[PDB]
Coordinates of C-alpha atoms in Angstrom, one line a residue:
Chain Y
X94 CA 113.6 117.3 118.2
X95 CA 110.5 115.2 117.5
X96 CA 108.5 115.7 114.3
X97 CA 106.1 113.1 112.8
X98 CA 107.6 112.2 109.4
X99 CA 106.7 109.9 106.6
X100 CA 109.1 107.6 104.8
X101 CA 109.6 108.6 101.1
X102 CA 106.7 107.6 98.9
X103 CA 108.3 107.1 95.5
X104 CA 108.4 103.3 95.4
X105 CA 104.7 103.1 96.5
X106 CA 103.4 105.9 94.1
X107 CA 104.4 103.7 91.2
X108 CA 102.0 101.0 92.4
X109 CA 98.8 103.0 92.8
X110 CA 96.2 102.5 90.1
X111 CA 92.6 103.7 89.5
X112 CA 90.0 101.0 89.8
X113 CA 86.5 101.5 88.5
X114 CA 83.4 99.2 88.4
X115 CA 80.4 100.7 86.8
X116 CA 80.3 104.2 88.2
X117 CA 82.2 103.5 91.4
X118 CA 85.9 104.6 91.5
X119 CA 88.6 104.1 94.1
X120 CA 92.3 103.2 94.4
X121 CA 94.1 99.9 94.0
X122 CA 97.7 98.7 94.5
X123 CA 99.4 97.0 91.5
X124 CA 102.1 94.5 92.4
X125 CA 103.3 92.1 89.7
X126 CA 100.2 91.1 87.8
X127 CA 97.7 91.6 90.7
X128 CA 95.7 94.7 91.7
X129 CA 94.4 94.6 95.3
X130 CA 91.5 97.0 96.1
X131 CA 88.6 97.3 98.6
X132 CA 85.6 95.2 97.6
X133 CA 83.4 98.3 98.2
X134 CA 84.1 99.0 94.5
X135 CA 81.5 96.4 93.4
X136 CA 78.8 97.5 95.9
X137 CA 75.4 98.4 94.4
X138 CA 74.2 101.9 94.9
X139 CA 71.6 101.5 97.7
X140 CA 70.9 102.5 101.3
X141 CA 70.2 98.9 102.5
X142 CA 72.8 96.5 103.9
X143 CA 75.2 95.4 101.2
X144 CA 75.4 91.7 100.4
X145 CA 78.9 91.3 99.1
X146 CA 78.6 87.6 98.3
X147 CA 75.7 88.4 96.0
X148 CA 77.5 91.4 94.5
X149 CA 80.5 89.1 93.9
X150 CA 78.2 86.4 92.3
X151 CA 76.7 88.9 89.8
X152 CA 80.1 90.4 88.9
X153 CA 81.0 91.0 85.2
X154 CA 84.7 91.3 84.3
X155 CA 83.9 93.7 81.5
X156 CA 82.4 96.2 84.0
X157 CA 85.9 96.8 85.5
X158 CA 88.3 99.5 84.3
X159 CA 91.8 99.5 85.8
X160 CA 94.2 102.2 84.7
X161 CA 97.7 103.6 85.6
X162 CA 98.3 107.2 84.5
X163 CA 95.6 107.0 81.9
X164 CA 96.8 103.6 80.4
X165 CA 94.3 100.8 80.7
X166 CA 95.3 97.4 82.0
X167 CA 93.4 94.3 80.7
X168 CA 91.4 92.5 83.5
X169 CA 91.8 88.7 83.4
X170 CA 89.9 87.5 86.5
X171 CA 88.8 88.6 90.0
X172 CA 88.6 86.9 93.4
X173 CA 87.3 88.1 96.7
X174 CA 89.3 87.7 100.0
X175 CA 87.6 89.1 103.0
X176 CA 87.2 92.9 102.5
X177 CA 89.4 93.1 99.3
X178 CA 89.4 92.0 95.7
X179 CA 92.5 90.6 93.9
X180 CA 92.2 91.6 90.3
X181 CA 94.5 89.7 87.9
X182 CA 95.6 91.9 85.0
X183 CA 97.4 90.9 81.8
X184 CA 100.4 93.1 82.4
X185 CA 102.9 93.1 85.3
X186 CA 104.0 96.3 87.0
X187 CA 107.6 96.8 85.9
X188 CA 108.1 99.0 88.9
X189 CA 106.9 96.5 91.5
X190 CA 109.3 97.1 94.5
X191 CA 110.8 94.3 96.6
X192 CA 108.0 93.8 99.1
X193 CA 106.2 91.7 101.7
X194 CA 102.7 91.9 103.3
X195 CA 102.6 92.5 107.1
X196 CA 99.7 92.7 109.5
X197 CA 100.1 95.7 111.9
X198 CA 99.6 95.5 115.7
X199 CA 98.3 98.3 117.9
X200 CA 101.1 100.7 118.7
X201 CA 102.7 100.2 115.3
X202 CA 103.7 103.2 113.2
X203 CA 103.3 103.3 109.5
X204 CA 102.9 105.6 106.5
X205 CA 99.8 106.5 104.5
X206 CA 99.9 107.5 100.9
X207 CA 96.5 109.3 100.4
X208 CA 95.3 108.8 96.9
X209 CA 92.3 110.0 94.8
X210 CA 91.3 108.5 91.4
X211 CA 94.6 106.5 91.4
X212 CA 96.8 109.5 92.0
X213 CA 98.7 110.2 95.2
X214 CA 98.0 113.5 96.9
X215 CA 99.7 113.4 100.3
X216 CA 101.8 111.2 102.6
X217 CA 101.9 111.2 106.3
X218 CA 102.9 109.0 109.3
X219 CA 100.2 107.5 111.5
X220 CA 100.1 105.0 114.5
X221 CA 97.6 102.2 114.8
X222 CA 95.6 102.7 118.0
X223 CA 94.5 100.1 120.5
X224 CA 90.9 100.3 119.0
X225 CA 92.5 99.4 115.6
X226 CA 91.7 102.8 114.1
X227 CA 93.9 105.6 112.8
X228 CA 93.6 109.4 112.8
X229 CA 94.2 110.1 109.1
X230 CA 93.2 112.8 106.7
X231 CA 90.9 111.4 104.1
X232 CA 88.1 112.9 102.0
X233 CA 85.8 111.2 99.5
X234 CA 87.6 108.9 97.1
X235 CA 90.4 107.9 99.4
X236 CA 89.2 104.3 99.7
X237 CA 92.1 101.9 98.8
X238 CA 94.8 104.3 99.8
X239 CA 97.8 102.2 100.9
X240 CA 99.8 102.1 104.2
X241 CA 103.4 100.9 104.2
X242 CA 106.7 100.8 105.9
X243 CA 110.1 100.6 104.2
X244 CA 112.7 98.3 105.8
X245 CA 116.4 99.0 106.1
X246 CA 117.1 96.7 103.2
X247 CA 114.6 98.5 100.9
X248 CA 111.8 96.0 101.3
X249 CA 108.4 97.6 101.3
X250 CA 106.0 96.2 103.9
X251 CA 102.4 96.7 102.6
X252 CA 100.2 96.7 105.7
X253 CA 97.1 98.8 105.2
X254 CA 94.3 99.6 102.7
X255 CA 92.0 102.4 103.6
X256 CA 88.4 101.1 103.9
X257 CA 86.0 103.4 105.7
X258 CA 85.5 106.4 108.0
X259 CA 83.5 105.8 111.2
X260 CA 80.9 108.2 112.5
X261 CA 83.5 109.4 115.0
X262 CA 85.8 110.5 112.2
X263 CA 88.3 107.6 112.9
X264 CA 89.6 105.7 110.0
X265 CA 89.4 101.9 109.4
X266 CA 91.4 99.8 107.0
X267 CA 92.2 96.2 106.1
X268 CA 95.5 94.4 105.5
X269 CA 96.3 92.9 102.1
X270 CA 94.7 89.6 103.1
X271 CA 91.3 91.3 103.4
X272 CA 91.1 91.1 107.2
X273 CA 89.7 94.4 108.5
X274 CA 91.7 95.7 111.5
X275 CA 89.4 95.6 114.5
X276 CA 86.9 93.5 112.4
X277 CA 84.8 96.6 111.7
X278 CA 82.2 96.2 108.9
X279 CA 83.4 97.5 105.5
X280 CA 80.2 99.3 104.7
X281 CA 78.2 102.3 106.0
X282 CA 76.8 101.6 109.5
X283 CA 76.4 102.9 113.1
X284 CA 79.4 101.1 114.5
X285 CA 81.2 102.8 117.5
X286 CA 84.8 101.9 118.3
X287 CA 85.9 101.2 121.8
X288 CA 87.8 103.9 123.6
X289 CA 91.5 104.2 123.0
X290 CA 94.1 103.4 125.7
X291 CA 97.3 105.4 126.1
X292 CA 100.2 103.5 124.4
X293 CA 102.5 103.3 127.4
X294 CA 105.5 102.1 125.2
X295 CA 105.2 105.3 123.1
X296 CA 104.9 107.5 126.2
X297 CA 108.1 106.1 127.5
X298 CA 109.9 106.7 124.2
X299 CA 108.5 110.3 124.1
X300 CA 109.8 111.0 127.7
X301 CA 113.3 109.7 126.7
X302 CA 113.2 112.2 123.8
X303 CA 112.5 115.1 126.2
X304 CA 115.4 114.0 128.4
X305 CA 117.8 114.0 125.4
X306 CA 116.8 117.7 124.9
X307 CA 117.4 118.9 128.5
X308 CA 113.7 118.8 129.2
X309 CA 113.5 117.1 132.7
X310 CA 111.5 119.3 135.1
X311 CA 109.0 116.4 135.1
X312 CA 111.5 113.7 136.0
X313 CA 110.4 111.8 139.1
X314 CA 113.2 110.8 141.5
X315 CA 111.5 107.6 142.7
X316 CA 110.7 104.4 140.7
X317 CA 107.8 102.1 140.1
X318 CA 108.5 98.6 138.9
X319 CA 106.7 97.2 135.9
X320 CA 104.2 95.1 137.8
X321 CA 103.2 98.1 139.9
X322 CA 102.8 100.3 136.8
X323 CA 100.8 97.7 134.9
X324 CA 98.2 97.6 137.8
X325 CA 98.0 101.4 137.7
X326 CA 97.7 101.3 133.9
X327 CA 94.7 99.0 133.9
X328 CA 92.9 101.3 136.3
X329 CA 93.7 104.5 134.4
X330 CA 93.4 104.0 130.7
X331 CA 97.0 103.0 129.7
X332 CA 98.3 99.8 128.1
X333 CA 100.7 97.5 130.0
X334 CA 104.4 98.4 129.4
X335 CA 106.0 95.8 127.2
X336 CA 109.6 95.4 128.4
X337 CA 112.4 97.4 130.0
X338 CA 115.3 96.0 128.0
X339 CA 114.4 97.7 124.7
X340 CA 115.0 101.2 126.1
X341 CA 118.5 100.2 127.2
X342 CA 119.8 102.5 124.4
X343 CA 117.9 105.5 125.7
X344 CA 118.4 104.2 129.3
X345 CA 122.2 104.6 128.6
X346 CA 122.4 108.2 127.4
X347 CA 120.1 109.7 129.9
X348 CA 120.9 107.7 132.1
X349 CA 117.4 107.0 133.3
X350 CA 115.7 103.7 134.0
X351 CA 112.3 102.9 132.5
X352 CA 111.0 102.6 136.1
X353 CA 111.7 106.3 136.8
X354 CA 109.7 107.2 133.7
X355 CA 106.9 104.9 134.7
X356 CA 106.8 106.8 138.0
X357 CA 106.8 110.1 136.1
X358 CA 103.8 108.9 134.0
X359 CA 101.9 108.3 137.2
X360 CA 102.6 111.9 138.4
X361 CA 102.1 113.6 135.0
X362 CA 98.8 111.7 134.2
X363 CA 101.5 119.6 133.5
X364 CA 100.1 122.6 135.3
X365 CA 100.6 124.4 133.2
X366 CA 104.1 123.6 132.0
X367 CA 105.2 121.8 128.8
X368 CA 107.1 118.9 127.4
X369 CA 108.6 119.3 123.9
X370 CA 105.7 121.4 122.7
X371 CA 103.0 119.2 124.3
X372 CA 100.7 120.1 127.2
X373 CA 99.8 116.4 127.9
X374 CA 101.6 113.1 127.5
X375 CA 102.0 112.0 123.8
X376 CA 101.8 108.4 122.6
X377 CA 102.4 109.3 118.9
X378 CA 106.0 108.2 118.6
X379 CA 107.4 104.7 118.9
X380 CA 110.8 103.7 120.3
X381 CA 112.2 103.1 116.8
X382 CA 111.1 106.5 115.6
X383 CA 112.7 108.3 118.5
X384 CA 116.0 106.4 118.0
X385 CA 116.0 106.9 114.2
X386 CA 115.1 110.5 114.4
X387 CA 117.8 111.3 117.0
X388 CA 120.7 109.1 116.1
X389 CA 119.8 107.7 112.6
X390 CA 120.0 104.2 114.2
Chain A
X116 CA 90.0 117.1 110.4
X117 CA 93.5 118.5 110.2
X118 CA 96.7 116.5 109.6
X119 CA 100.0 118.0 108.5
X120 CA 100.9 116.1 105.3
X121 CA 103.7 116.3 102.7
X122 CA 103.1 116.1 99.0
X123 CA 104.4 112.9 97.4
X124 CA 108.2 112.8 97.1
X125 CA 108.8 110.4 94.2
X126 CA 109.7 113.0 91.6
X127 CA 112.2 114.7 93.9
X128 CA 113.8 111.5 95.2
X129 CA 115.0 110.9 91.6
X130 CA 117.0 114.1 91.7
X131 CA 118.8 113.7 95.1
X132 CA 122.5 113.0 94.8
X133 CA 125.5 112.5 97.1
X134 CA 128.1 115.3 96.8
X135 CA 131.6 114.7 98.2
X136 CA 134.6 117.1 98.2
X137 CA 137.7 115.6 99.9
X138 CA 136.3 114.1 103.1
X139 CA 133.2 116.3 103.3
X140 CA 129.8 114.8 102.2
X141 CA 126.4 116.3 101.8
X142 CA 123.3 116.3 99.5
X143 CA 122.7 117.9 96.2
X144 CA 119.9 118.2 93.6
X145 CA 120.5 117.0 90.0
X146 CA 118.3 118.7 87.3
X147 CA 119.4 118.4 83.7
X148 CA 123.2 118.4 83.7
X149 CA 123.5 120.6 86.8
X150 CA 123.9 119.6 90.5
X151 CA 123.1 122.3 93.0
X152 CA 124.5 121.9 96.6
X153 CA 125.5 124.0 99.5
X154 CA 129.0 125.5 99.2
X155 CA 129.8 124.2 102.7
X156 CA 131.0 121.1 100.8
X157 CA 134.3 122.9 99.8
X158 CA 135.0 124.3 103.3
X159 CA 138.4 123.5 104.8
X160 CA 138.4 121.6 108.1
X161 CA 139.2 124.3 110.7
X162 CA 137.6 126.2 113.6
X163 CA 138.3 129.8 112.3
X164 CA 136.2 131.8 109.9
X165 CA 135.7 130.2 106.5
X166 CA 136.8 132.4 103.6
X167 CA 134.7 130.9 100.8
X168 CA 136.2 133.0 98.1
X169 CA 139.6 131.6 98.9
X170 CA 138.2 128.1 99.1
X171 CA 136.6 128.5 95.7
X172 CA 139.8 129.9 94.1
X173 CA 141.8 126.9 95.3
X174 CA 139.1 124.3 94.5
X175 CA 140.1 121.5 92.0
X176 CA 137.5 119.5 90.1
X177 CA 139.1 116.1 90.7
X178 CA 138.4 116.4 94.5
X179 CA 134.7 116.1 93.8
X180 CA 132.7 112.9 93.8
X181 CA 129.0 113.0 92.8
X182 CA 126.7 110.0 92.8
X183 CA 123.1 109.0 92.3
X184 CA 122.2 105.8 94.1
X185 CA 125.9 104.8 94.0
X186 CA 126.4 105.6 90.3
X187 CA 129.1 108.2 90.0
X188 CA 128.8 111.2 87.7
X189 CA 131.7 113.0 86.1
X190 CA 132.3 116.6 87.1
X191 CA 132.9 119.1 84.3
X192 CA 132.9 122.5 85.9
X193 CA 131.8 124.4 89.1
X194 CA 130.6 127.9 89.8
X195 CA 129.7 129.6 93.0
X196 CA 126.4 131.6 93.5
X197 CA 125.9 133.0 97.0
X198 CA 125.8 130.0 99.3
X199 CA 125.4 127.2 96.7
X200 CA 127.6 125.6 94.0
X201 CA 126.4 124.7 90.6
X202 CA 128.2 121.6 89.5
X203 CA 128.0 120.7 85.8
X204 CA 128.1 117.0 85.3
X205 CA 128.8 115.1 82.1
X206 CA 125.3 113.5 81.8
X207 CA 121.8 114.8 82.2
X208 CA 119.3 113.3 84.7
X209 CA 116.8 111.4 82.5
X210 CA 114.2 111.7 85.3
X211 CA 114.3 115.5 85.6
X212 CA 110.8 116.6 86.4
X213 CA 109.1 119.6 84.9
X214 CA 110.2 122.3 87.4
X215 CA 110.8 125.9 88.3
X216 CA 112.7 127.7 91.0
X217 CA 110.8 129.8 93.5
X218 CA 111.8 131.8 96.5
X219 CA 109.6 131.4 99.6
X220 CA 108.1 134.2 101.7
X221 CA 107.3 133.9 105.4
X222 CA 104.0 132.1 105.9
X223 CA 104.5 129.9 102.8
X224 CA 104.1 126.1 103.4
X225 CA 106.4 123.7 101.6
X226 CA 107.8 120.1 101.8
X227 CA 111.1 119.0 103.0
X228 CA 112.7 115.7 101.8
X229 CA 115.3 115.0 104.5
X230 CA 118.3 113.2 103.0
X231 CA 121.6 111.7 104.2
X232 CA 124.5 110.8 102.0
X233 CA 122.3 111.3 98.9
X234 CA 119.5 109.1 100.1
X235 CA 116.1 110.4 101.2
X236 CA 115.0 109.2 104.7
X237 CA 111.9 111.2 105.5
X238 CA 109.4 113.7 104.2
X239 CA 107.3 116.3 106.0
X240 CA 105.4 119.6 105.5
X241 CA 106.8 122.8 107.1
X242 CA 106.1 126.5 107.1
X243 CA 108.6 129.3 106.6
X244 CA 108.3 131.3 109.8
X245 CA 108.5 135.1 110.1
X246 CA 112.1 134.9 111.4
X247 CA 113.0 133.0 108.1
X248 CA 113.7 129.7 109.9
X249 CA 111.9 126.4 109.9
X250 CA 111.4 123.8 112.6
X251 CA 112.6 120.6 110.9
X252 CA 113.9 117.3 112.1
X253 CA 117.5 117.1 110.8
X254 CA 120.5 115.3 112.2
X255 CA 124.1 115.4 111.0
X256 CA 124.4 115.0 107.3
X257 CA 121.1 116.7 106.3
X258 CA 122.9 119.7 104.6
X259 CA 121.5 120.1 101.1
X260 CA 118.2 118.4 101.7
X261 CA 115.7 120.0 99.3
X262 CA 112.4 121.8 99.9
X263 CA 109.7 121.7 97.2
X264 CA 106.1 122.3 96.3
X265 CA 104.1 120.5 93.5
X266 CA 101.8 122.8 91.6
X267 CA 98.4 121.5 90.3
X268 CA 99.8 121.2 86.8
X269 CA 102.6 118.9 88.1
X270 CA 105.4 121.5 88.0
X271 CA 107.8 121.1 90.9
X272 CA 108.8 124.3 92.5
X273 CA 112.3 123.9 94.1
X274 CA 112.5 126.5 96.9
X275 CA 114.8 125.4 99.7
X276 CA 118.2 123.7 100.3
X277 CA 119.1 123.0 103.9
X278 CA 122.2 124.9 105.0
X279 CA 122.7 125.0 108.8
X280 CA 121.2 124.6 112.3
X281 CA 121.4 127.6 114.6
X282 CA 122.3 127.2 118.3
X283 CA 118.7 127.5 119.3
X284 CA 117.8 124.5 117.1
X285 CA 116.3 126.6 114.4
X286 CA 117.0 125.5 110.8
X287 CA 118.2 127.8 108.0
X288 CA 118.3 127.2 104.3
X289 CA 118.9 128.9 100.9
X290 CA 116.9 129.1 97.7
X291 CA 118.4 127.7 94.6
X292 CA 119.9 131.1 93.6
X293 CA 122.1 130.8 96.8
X294 CA 120.3 133.5 98.8
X295 CA 120.1 132.4 102.4
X296 CA 116.6 132.9 103.8
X297 CA 116.9 135.7 106.4
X298 CA 120.5 136.4 105.4
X299 CA 122.1 134.2 108.0
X300 CA 125.7 133.2 107.6
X301 CA 126.2 129.8 106.0
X302 CA 128.9 128.7 108.5
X303 CA 129.1 128.1 112.3
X304 CA 128.6 131.3 114.2
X305 CA 126.8 132.8 117.2
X306 CA 123.8 134.3 115.2
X307 CA 120.3 134.2 116.7
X308 CA 117.1 134.4 114.8
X309 CA 114.5 137.0 115.7
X310 CA 111.4 136.2 117.7
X311 CA 108.8 134.1 115.9
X312 CA 105.4 135.7 115.2
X313 CA 102.1 133.8 115.1
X314 CA 101.0 133.5 111.5
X315 CA 97.6 135.2 111.8
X316 CA 96.3 134.0 108.4
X317 CA 96.9 130.4 109.5
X318 CA 95.2 130.9 112.8
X319 CA 92.1 132.2 111.0
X320 CA 92.1 129.1 108.8
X321 CA 92.5 126.9 111.9
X322 CA 89.5 128.6 113.6
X323 CA 87.4 128.0 110.5
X324 CA 88.4 124.3 110.6
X325 CA 87.2 124.2 114.3
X326 CA 83.8 125.7 113.3
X327 CA 83.5 123.2 110.5
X328 CA 84.1 120.4 113.0
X329 CA 81.4 121.8 115.4
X330 CA 83.8 123.4 117.9
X331 CA 82.6 126.9 118.7
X332 CA 82.7 127.4 122.5
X333 CA 85.3 130.1 121.9
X334 CA 83.5 132.1 119.2
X335 CA 83.3 135.9 119.8
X336 CA 80.3 137.9 118.7
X337 CA 82.5 141.0 118.9
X338 CA 84.1 142.2 115.6
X339 CA 87.5 143.7 115.1
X340 CA 88.3 145.1 111.7
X341 CA 91.6 144.4 109.8
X342 CA 93.3 147.7 110.6
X343 CA 92.5 147.4 114.3
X344 CA 93.6 143.8 114.5
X345 CA 96.9 144.6 112.8
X346 CA 97.6 147.2 115.3
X347 CA 96.8 144.8 118.1
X348 CA 98.9 142.1 116.5
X349 CA 102.0 144.4 116.5
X350 CA 101.8 144.5 120.3
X351 CA 101.0 140.8 120.9
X352 CA 103.4 138.7 118.8
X353 CA 101.1 138.1 115.8
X354 CA 101.5 139.0 112.1
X355 CA 99.1 141.3 110.3
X356 CA 96.1 139.5 108.6
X357 CA 96.7 139.7 104.9
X358 CA 93.1 139.8 103.5
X359 CA 89.6 138.7 104.4
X360 CA 88.0 137.9 101.0
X361 CA 90.2 134.8 100.4
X362 CA 88.2 133.1 103.3
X363 CA 84.7 133.7 101.8
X364 CA 84.2 130.0 101.0
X365 CA 84.5 129.2 104.7
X366 CA 82.8 132.3 105.9
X367 CA 79.7 131.4 103.8
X368 CA 79.6 127.8 105.2
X369 CA 80.1 128.6 108.9
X370 CA 78.7 131.4 108.6
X371 CA 81.1 133.5 110.6
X372 CA 83.0 136.6 109.4
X373 CA 86.8 137.0 109.5
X374 CA 86.3 140.0 111.7
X375 CA 84.6 137.8 114.3
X376 CA 87.6 135.4 114.2
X377 CA 90.0 138.3 114.6
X378 CA 88.1 139.3 117.7
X379 CA 88.2 135.6 118.8
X380 CA 92.0 135.5 118.4
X381 CA 92.3 138.6 120.7
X382 CA 90.0 136.8 123.2
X383 CA 91.9 133.5 123.0
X384 CA 95.4 135.1 122.8
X385 CA 96.3 133.9 126.2
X386 CA 95.3 130.3 126.9
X387 CA 92.0 128.5 126.6
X388 CA 91.9 127.7 130.3
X389 CA 91.7 124.8 130.2
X390 CA 89.6 123.8 127.2
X391 CA 90.8 122.7 123.8
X392 CA 90.1 123.5 120.1
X393 CA 90.6 120.5 117.9
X394 CA 92.8 119.0 120.6
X395 CA 95.1 122.0 120.8
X396 CA 95.5 123.8 124.1
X397 CA 96.6 127.1 122.5
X398 CA 96.0 128.7 119.1
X399 CA 97.6 126.8 116.2
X400 CA 99.3 128.5 113.2
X401 CA 100.5 125.3 111.6
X402 CA 97.8 125.1 108.8
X403 CA 97.3 127.4 105.8
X404 CA 93.9 128.3 104.3
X405 CA 94.8 126.2 101.2
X406 CA 95.5 123.2 103.5
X407 CA 92.2 123.6 105.4
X408 CA 90.3 123.9 102.1
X409 CA 92.2 121.1 100.4
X410 CA 92.1 118.7 103.3
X411 CA 88.4 119.4 104.0
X412 CA 87.0 119.7 100.5
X413 CA 89.7 118.6 98.0
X414 CA 89.9 122.1 96.5

């Protein structure tokens, strides 16, 4: 059984705040005595290109309002780091979880807490694509919604702050240092993202899941080695496969080598059959997710 | 755009507890000074039929252990109600949210917080299907994982407690009164759920979402009224359509009538061959009208 799930959101909900500057309102993340939010909150209302350095230079602290559940935090100072602001406030969040900041790589799964006016409304799992966008669900006001993972030891990894929706509908965010994933511009524009590749690592994980449920009509008897597959992958819109040793767990139970699944990917690249609900190959689930969702390991 | 989401889980996480009886461990929900959990926790280890009335009469309170995040709670009394136990503990949960209990009906969406040994590990949205089962992701230890909805005023509706997995993989739970959805037995058996029907109300919502995303290659100009569609649905694995006026927000915007979508379902009932609608290769009944409206417009 494979279902996209999110990790529980309680520890992150207690960090979401409402950040307002003049009339513009979005979400921020309150950790210790710092609130991080997208710098879009200080943009002027215009249709011309936004000059954020000038906006930052004309900033007044008294124009900020930062609140958590209707209680207002005193703003002490603000600095700009790439596409985000770090707002120092005069009160520390007593519910700050143990945490680190982590920069995602394409193929990484994480969780989104979708927020509006500082209040969480939904939580869902997503995967960072090779073009550094995600397929979320966001409407107006979701800017600043955080992305996170929770480690085994309880440590929250803060990895994403929602920034913008592209004309394609794909979603763009930054990490907490202010670097925009994919280096997209954090303001309205005509930018078009490059085409996504199929995440071969995730396809392999998904095929192991089907094997563990007796679904094996698609299993190729022959093998391709990694160097052969990676040549085919370049010419057919797939990423290179990372390693074979990681799948040794799943290679045990099945007991199927990665090279047999690489061969199956070439053949399946269903007429009109089906794999675990899907009619084409799925790159939504990582190796870790499959292992955690099937064995709790 | 359409993404299956869960509502935030924080207020429910603070109610999840670990319930142990002898060697058996599962999850419970702690509200006020009461813990509700599946009565499976007091079942003897055996392979023959469980007589829960006998298990209850021989139950002793000192065999229970109940904890929240490792802090153990004292057990004061226990009563049995259908397939759940109500365990009175000697302190109240100071983080009990405002809440009610509500029994789901087929077609209702809700949220599952999947828990193991009293600790939440995942959260996801689900629909109660017409055969009174859900398609979750549970492994060993998920018994007692709660289902919930959060009303607009912040009230939590507690509606589901995970009970058992059928041999087909289908998942079965009870409400907090102990009534098992679909009246399945709450112990290992050979029972099989009835055939799933496509939730027609959800398919209509999904087709409105497609139209709002500019996907209309499939749209029929023919019209089928509600009575005719419900007769067709009987013969073709679909539920009746409940009403048409609830969709008027989307009908005005698109601007396509529900009766045109009913005709479209009949036209698309077998595959799309081999086109897609919002990425799907067959009709999707995963999303409710409320979800489409809330995800598209925030309403």
